[PDB]
Structure formats: structure tokens, C-alpha cells
Design a protein around this ligand. Sequence first.
Ligand SMILES: OC[C@H]1O[C@H](O)[C@H](O)[C@@H](O)[C@@H]1O
Ligand SMILES: [Ca+2]
Length: 559
Amino acid sequence: NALPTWWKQAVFYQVYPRSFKDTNGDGIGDLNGIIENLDYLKKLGIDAIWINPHYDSPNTDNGYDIRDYRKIMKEYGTMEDFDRLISEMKKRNMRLMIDIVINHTSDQHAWFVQSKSGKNNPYRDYYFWRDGKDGHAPNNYPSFFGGSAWEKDDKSGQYYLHYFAKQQPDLNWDNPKVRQDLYDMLRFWLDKGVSGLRFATVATYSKIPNFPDLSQQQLKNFAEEYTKGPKIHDYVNEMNREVLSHYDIATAGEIFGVPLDKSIKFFDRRRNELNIAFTFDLIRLDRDADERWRRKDWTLSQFRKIVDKVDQTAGEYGWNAFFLDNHDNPRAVSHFGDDRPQWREHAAKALATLTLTQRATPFIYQGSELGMTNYPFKKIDDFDDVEVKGFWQDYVETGKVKAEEFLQNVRQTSRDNSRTPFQWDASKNAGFTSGTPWLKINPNYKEINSADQINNPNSVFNYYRKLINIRHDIPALTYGSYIDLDPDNNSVYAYTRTLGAEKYLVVINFKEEVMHYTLPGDLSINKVITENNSHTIVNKNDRQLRLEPWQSGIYKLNP
Ligand SMILES: OC[C@H]1O[C@H](O)[C@H](O)[C@@H](O)[C@@H]1O
Ligand SMILES: [Ca+2]
């Protein structure tokens, strides 16, 4: 086969509206700020935008705790703004993907308000209410965001389930009336001409019959137990049959907690579930499975073996998204590259090259196109994220981990690293806001901003632009098959992308010294498609490359 679609060949950009552009001085990005910057995105070469949740929310989890699914978040604007965003993107031939958060609602959602009003309320079993055991929680389930996954309610004396914050009660998908209400809600958004849906933690919808305790072992890897719900594929396939297949959309599945060998069932096109896999294997390759804020050393051989495994898993019938950072992870150049002033731009370009030459839909997270870095967090109160406060409570306040060792890690791992405001220019607060930004701007905005880069042909921005253009022009870079030349090489990452006789080579030097790299077999260069940081010229039929430190390139190979 090889079944091309607009979503397989799109280059997506992810906008985290809270941090993109504030147009009214309250310190918080808003819909008008996205609208006002569409020409900037269009100039980058972006096809499609995925926005993080835009709905009415008290913001315990920055939009992921939704109090009304049919209303715009007060901080982002009005319904008129949203409809104008859709319409201005349509004018520019850009498609919008929205974030669908239906594993749970805010505890202020009308459904929960009613549900918690008493056992006899019609909405009682829109959520999960269970009696305690021996004066304790129903079972030993922990929450991703701190403490127990069960919260006691005084009125009724029962506990309600929350995998995420106390303010995110989990919806009861086993109740057909819940599923039918959530479908009605999707059609409301789909009817406005939205072109994609990203399903937040899509794999936790089905809860485990009778809530048994997790074993000591399971407590150290509990996400995977929450994804074992026996009806998860029935529910996703049902939502496909009753809603998704009735519209013309691309659907992404965020499979948090799903082992890779179980991912294909969500994305195999024959199964009629979802289109695009968001996996965690690569982006958190170096994260501890138990203490999930903690990181460890990783090597290039480990990284490339994951890329290849994730590629093979999707195989012929599935499809991958490919991203190196987003609003839940550290910035790619700091995490996967070298963010020191001598290497930052070279590494950012190398990782852009890697990103834009995967057999996957690439997602470019806001500010990565400038080479934005992690933020120098000092003290615990410099962080905002509910998640980091939950880890601090579980691990530091219980005395299990010294505060300083915890900070050493979360400085490198915290989601807030991606959430500092987008650095537009060199002006006060990087031009993000006229007032006080909700989260401090990185002081490196003076060196790293869009205004310094958009007209500089050597910039990280224009290198991304050139790579998008190249990807659009060379079908092997989207659909071609992927072969790693040496999964055990810890210095030079080299792989081929092949469609029939059209064969391309991507080479990235991960070392900060010169690497000579002789090609294997009979491979030789036909053309240089692009390089960054090269010094030696590549001629026809070369079988060797002298790679500068952090050099990256794409080459066409002779047939
Ligand atoms: O709401 C729970 C979580 O699920 C989502 O899919 C988001 O990516 C993450 O930011 C959020 O905290
Ligand atoms: Ca604002």
C-alpha cells in the first residue's frame, strides 16, 4: 500500500494558548493572541494547529479541568473569538485540532455538582462513588497528581475517583448515558468545522471491574494498570462508529500509560479507532517509572532503538505522531540537545532535522522553532504546575527525598519548562504581554526571540522553514521506510528514508567534536539536500562525511 492523507503529510504546530500571546495585558495568552499571529505560523510553513484546552475551567490543571465543555475559557476570550480563529485559519488554509478531555471533568462541572448532591441524584453514576474500606479509601489507588486517587465526600460518606487532581473527578464511561452526552458534546465542536481532535489520556476511560487493590509491584508502575480497562477498545470504537467516522477529521490518541506492544490497537486503521499515535516511549526514555519526576542518564543508542521500535510498531496499518517536547515535557534543545550558547542553535537545527524526517506526522511545539530552552527554576515556589506540587507533597514533605535533590531533578523534568511565555521579541517581557506574565519569562529572551530570527536566513526559525519546505517536496521524507544504519552507535545518528528507488540519508553528529563517518555497503551521495554546520564540501559519489560537532544534514543517495 502507502495510503496518503492530509494528516499524514501535515506539519502540525502546537499552541499552548496560556503562554502564546497576551493581547489584553492580564499576563495570560488568549485567542486573539493566536489570531494575531497566524501569519507568523503561515510564514513558518505550518499546515495545522493543535490548541491545548480552550474551555471554561477553574484552571487547577490549566484547562484540563473543564467546568463547561460548551463555553470558552474566560481568560482566552469569547465564543466569537473562537469562531473567528476557525475562520481566519480557514482563510489561510490551516486546519484546527482541539483537545478533547473526557476522562474527567472539573469538580465544578454541573454534572459533578449534581452527582455529589446525593446518592439518589440522576447524575450520581456519571462518576465513580465507592464506600471506604476499614475507615480508609476504597483501595490503595494513587493519584498522578499527589496522594490517593480517592477523595472522601462528607455529605454522602462515599469516596469519588480521581486519577488526576482532586478537582478532576473521573467520568463513568461504563454508563451509556455519559458516553452519549460526551458524543453530543463532540458534535457541537465538530459542527463548527474543527478538523482534528486530540484525545487526552485516551487510554484510561475504562475502569477496572470491582476496583481491586494494586500489588506492591503495581504501585510503582500504576499508570499501566489504569490502561488495562477491559472495555477501552469497545468505547473508543463505539465513539468512532457513532461520532468520529461521521466527520472528516484527524484524531490523535494520547496513550499515556500504554506499553508500546499495546498501542497498535488504538491506531490500526482496520480497527476504526483513532488515526495518530502520541506515545511516551521516546520523550520520557530517561524518566523513572516509579518516581516519575526523576530523570536518569540516557545514550544515543538507547534513543535510536526507541525511534526504531516506535516506527516498527506503527508498521503498515498504524501511524505515529513524532515530537521531542510539548507542554508536558522539558524543551527539546535542553533535554535532547545541548543548550549552551556555543551549541544551542546547531543542536536545535539538528533536532529539527531529525523531527522533520520521520515516518510520522511531526508536531512542532511553540517556541521550539526558535530554539527556546528550559527555564532556570530555583526554588519550589518558582513552579506553578499542580503536578510538581503533588510530587513535592508525596516525596519531599514526607521526608522521602531531600528538597534539593528533588529540585535538581524537577528543574530538568518539570512541565513548566515548556510553559514559560513564547519569546516574540527583545522588548520588555519578550513582547508577550503589556502587563505581568502569569509565569516568568526566560531572561534568555534577549538572545532567543522570533524578531531576531524571522528575517535572518541563518536562524533556527528559517532552518525549520527550509526543512518543512523540503519535507513537502520529497515524498520519501514522509512515507518512505526507515532503516537505522547502526542502532548501537552512540555518536553519529544515521538513517535512511526510502520509497522505491528514491533513497535519502539523514546524518546527525551528537558529539561536540569532529566525527568522521564512512557510509556502509555501497551507499554514496548523489546530492546534498541541506546541512547545518558543515565545513567540508560534499561531492558526487562521496562515501564519507567529516561531521563538524552538532552537524546535521539530509542527502540523496545514488540508486
Ligand atoms: O488532565 C490530565 C493531563 O492530561 C492531558 O492529556 C495533558 O496533556 C496534561 O497536560 C494534563 O495534565
Ligand atoms: Ca490575555
